[PDB]
């Protein structure tokens, strides 16, 4: 190998939108020889070097190599404003250090439409029904969808991944599963969506019987 | 270069629709790379459940960026064979290779699980737009190989996109297909239907319709 | 016995069939009957650490593969044109009662040694348990 | 307990005859191996493993031979007939059940007995007890 390999990952979308979470870009170096496991990390925010990063203890890989990870916390606003994050990896086995940079996607942000759809009449014969949340017209594809009720987070739901639509934006569906009982009882459910292009980055759409 | 246990082999299965829909013939591909220029000659062998067959066809060789070749042998297999779980094998041997590389391929088995199809009309809120979304929910199926199509008045709709299969809480898959149509067509009472083709369906085919409530 | 040892040889002018198990039909030593010449397989009676080694004569390409209970453990290949060479291989394995060990060939199956060059497969228990 | 085991190599071997003499001892626990004759002598009855890795540049055929009550017992042969003037290692080995007094040694075919003589690389003859009788 031309020495180690670097992979720079973006922050968890949820982390970037809540004040109580701390977003971080992650730099992962794989295939770090047992011969030379020492690795040096250099981070840069728009060019300026930063020293707040933190490296984790190396991890022994099953195929006799090392994995070294460096974590750089970032400021919510820095990230959403498009600041570039550069990770510079150095190893004795590396002819020249490897550099990787990432930033939030640029293209026109497009605000998502949220639509809740009740169970199909046919499904109402089953014990569990499907509540559906259609989310479409958004860009970037980074988004977070959740379901809640009575101010509490639901458990049983899966969301499809973002999917490219005909006009260049994305859509996805989230499916909540609940006992036909709860639906019949008239309980109200909400589909929560967090996307940068939404007013205040958050919107909800309720769903219930009748 | 020259630091490999000879060239390497990778096999690929036919495309889902091809295996389900008849309009297309099944095709199992066997690709080869890292074929040094010192020994470009490559030969393939095909074994169906052990029983050899030569009805295969080999496409010409091409050159790679770092001095390697890309030889491919496409054995158009059969629907019955594949769907039954017929095990296929592509054995390749090269002089620059120490041992004859051979790989096997076959349909992903499993309970099968019968898919439930549900059509869902546009949300009231979307009705203010010029185009609306007709949704088709397909859940409970296994394996993931499936086909979803939309039609109206005997003709196939164009404008629709289906999410990829998504693993559900219980091991089955579910997906959603979104058909976009002008609000007018929806209100004119046209009837739309979602066709699903899957192995665990009676006759491997099912349909669900969707149209504006009686009214107009 | 409470021990296990064998040295078998292949006495035939015809090589093995391609992609098949290598049968050693003749016995030099095999007191416990651990190696079965009828199936060409060694079957563990006494659990423990074993050493397996072979020296196979060939006058064309030959790859010998050692299998343990259905799993290919090691493969060694020797290439030759018309002249005679010896393909060798070996491995230490900690076996359990009932486990099978055997040698096989792939598309390179030649074991036609010249007059005076033979093929042998040996195995023996080192540490009981 | 018995620990008969040896490994001997070639460096300054007396030539002559078809017996291959490994004159330089690396290991010889209980001195079973005679570096002057190339013969191993069994003291402890039992099953032994013997093996050789010999260097040749032309044509060589070797066999592990034994004797019991002075009676010679010919066995398997192992050859390398590449004959290109380049290093080739011929190897061979087997388990032998020996009785007290039996002798084991490597013999070369008189018509194909070329063994490398030099300091570039080595030829070895090894043997050890597997278990006593």
């Amino acid at each position: 190998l031309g020495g180690p390999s670097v992979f720079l990952f973006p922050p968890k979308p949820k982390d970037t939108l809540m004040i109580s979470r701390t977003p971080e870009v992650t730099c992962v170096v794989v295939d770090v020889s047992h011969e030379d496991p020492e690795v040096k990390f250099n981070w840069y925010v728009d060019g300026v070097e930063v020293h707040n990063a933190k490296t984790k203890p190396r991890e022994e890989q099953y195929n006799s190599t090392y994995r070294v990870v460096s974590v750089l916390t970032v400021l919510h606003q820095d990230w959403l404003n498009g600041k570039e994050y550069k990770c510079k990896v150095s190893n004795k086995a590396l002819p020249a250090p490897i550099e990787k940079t990432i930033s939030k996607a640029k293209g026109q942000p497009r605000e998502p439409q949220v639509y809740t759809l009740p169970p199909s009449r046919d499904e109402l014969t089953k014990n569990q029904v499907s509540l559906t949340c259609l989310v479409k017209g958004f860009y970037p594809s980074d988004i977070a969808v959740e379901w809640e009720s009575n101010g509490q987070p639901e458990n049983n739901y899966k969301t499809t991944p973002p999917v490219l639509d005909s006009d260049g934006s994305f859509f996805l569906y989230s499916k909540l599963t609940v006992d036909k009982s709860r639906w019949q009882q008239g309980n109200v459910f909400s589909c929560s969506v967090m996307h940068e292009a939404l007013h205040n980055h958050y919107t909800q759409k309720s769903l219930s019987l009748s | 270069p020259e630091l490999l246990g000879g060239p390497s082999v990778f096999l690929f299965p036919p495309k889902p629709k091809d295996t389900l829909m008849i309009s297309r013939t099944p095709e199992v591909t066997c690709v080869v790379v890292d074929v040094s220029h010192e020994d470009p000659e490559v030969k393939f062998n095909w074994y169906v459940d052990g029983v050899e067959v030569h009805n295969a066809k080999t496409k010409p060789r091409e050159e790679q960026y770092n001095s390697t070749y890309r030889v491919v042998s496409v054995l158009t297999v059969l629907h019955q064979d594949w769907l039954n779980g017929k095990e296929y094998k592509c054995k390749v041997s090269n002089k620059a290779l120490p041992a004859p590389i051979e790989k096997t391929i076959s349909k992903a088995k499993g309970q099968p699980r019968e898919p439930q199809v549900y059509t869902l009309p546009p949300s009231r809120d979307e009705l203010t737009k010029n185009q609306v979304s007709l949704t088709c929910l397909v859940k409970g199926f296994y394996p993931s190989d499936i086909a979803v199509e939309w039609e109206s008045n005997g003709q196939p709709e164009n404008n629709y996109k289906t999410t990829p299969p998504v693993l559900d809480s219980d091991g089955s898959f579910f997906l959603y297909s979104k058909l976009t149509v002008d609000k007018s067509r929806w209100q004119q009472g046209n009837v739309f239907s979602c066709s699903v083709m899957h192995e665990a369906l009676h006759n491997h085919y099912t349909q669900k319709s969707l149209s504006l409530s009686p009214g107009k | 016995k409470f021990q296990s040892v064998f040295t078998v040889t292949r006495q035939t002018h015809q090589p093995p069939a391609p992609n098949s198990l290598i049968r050693f039909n003749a016995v030099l030593t095999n007191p416990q009957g651990d190696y079965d010449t009828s199936t060409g397989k060694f079957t563990c009676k006494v659990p423990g650490l074993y050493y397996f080694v072979y020296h196979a004569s060939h006058t064309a390409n030959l790859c010998v593969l050692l299998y343990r209970s259905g799993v290919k453990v090691v493969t060694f290949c020797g290439h030759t044109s018309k002249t005679n060479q010896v393909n060798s291989g070996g491995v230490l394995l900690r076996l359990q009662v009932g486990e099978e060990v055997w040698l096989a060939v792939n598309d390179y199956y030649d074991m036609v040694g010249i007059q005076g060059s033979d093929s042998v497969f040996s195995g023996f228990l080192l540490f009981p348990d | 307990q018995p620990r008969p085991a040896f490994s001997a190599i070639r460096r300054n071997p007396p030539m002559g005859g078809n017996v291959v003499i490994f004159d330089t001892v690396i290991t010889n626990q209980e001195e079973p191996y005679q570096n002057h004759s190339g013969r191993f002598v069994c003291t402890v009855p039992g099953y032994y493993y013997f093996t050789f890795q010999v260097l040749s540049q032309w044509e060589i055929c070797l066999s592990i031979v034994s004797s019991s009550r002075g009676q010679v017992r010919r066995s398997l042969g192992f050859c390398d007939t590449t004959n290109k003037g380049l290093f080739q290692v011929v190897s061979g080995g087997m388990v032998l059940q020996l009785q007290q007094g039996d002798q084991v040694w490597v013999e070369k075919d008189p018509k194909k007995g070329h063994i490398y003589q030099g300091s570039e690389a080595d030829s070895v003859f090894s043997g050890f007890l597997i278990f006593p009788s």
């Binding site: 047992h34 | - | - | 380049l86 290692v89 050890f128």
Partner: protein, 132 residues
């Protein structure tokens, strides 16, 4: 009751440099864990008699030095086996009396044609014959 044995193959896809200590990274067996899978050296815990052996696949000329020693290693023997435009499998072996703390390993030479892969293996093994 000292059951010591190891068998390790080389799967790392990187050439061998002259005087470099062979590293058989893949362990099949390592009873008493006296062999270092990561590296490629055996280190004697229990002194006594051991048998060491290897089978190396190769695509060209190959020479290997069998090494022994404590803080300073020395060479017992050198095994060479040549191949001209062809593939080969070669072997070497040695019985060595070992003292506690001594390590045994294979060291590459100027002839480093050694293959370590699926279908063309290179293995290094060792086992205790009799404890001192």
């Amino acid at each position: 009751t000292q059951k010591i044995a190891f068998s390790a193959t080389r799967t790392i896809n990187v050439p061998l440099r002259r005087d470099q200590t062979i590293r058989f990274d893949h362990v099949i067996t390592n009873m008493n864990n006296n062999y270092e899978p990561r590296s490629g050296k055996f280190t004697c815990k229990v002194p006594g008699l051991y048998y060491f052996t290897y089978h190396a696949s190769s695509r060209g000329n190959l020479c290997v030095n069998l090494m022994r020693g404590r803080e300073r290693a020395q060479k017992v023997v050198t095994f060479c086996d040549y191949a001209y435009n062809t593939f080969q499998v070669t072997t070497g072996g040695m019985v060595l009396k070992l003292e506690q703390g001594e390590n045994v390993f294979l060291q590459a030479t100027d002839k480093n044609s050694l293959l370590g892969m699926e279908g063309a293996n290179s293995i290094f093994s060792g086992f205790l014959l009799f404890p001192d």
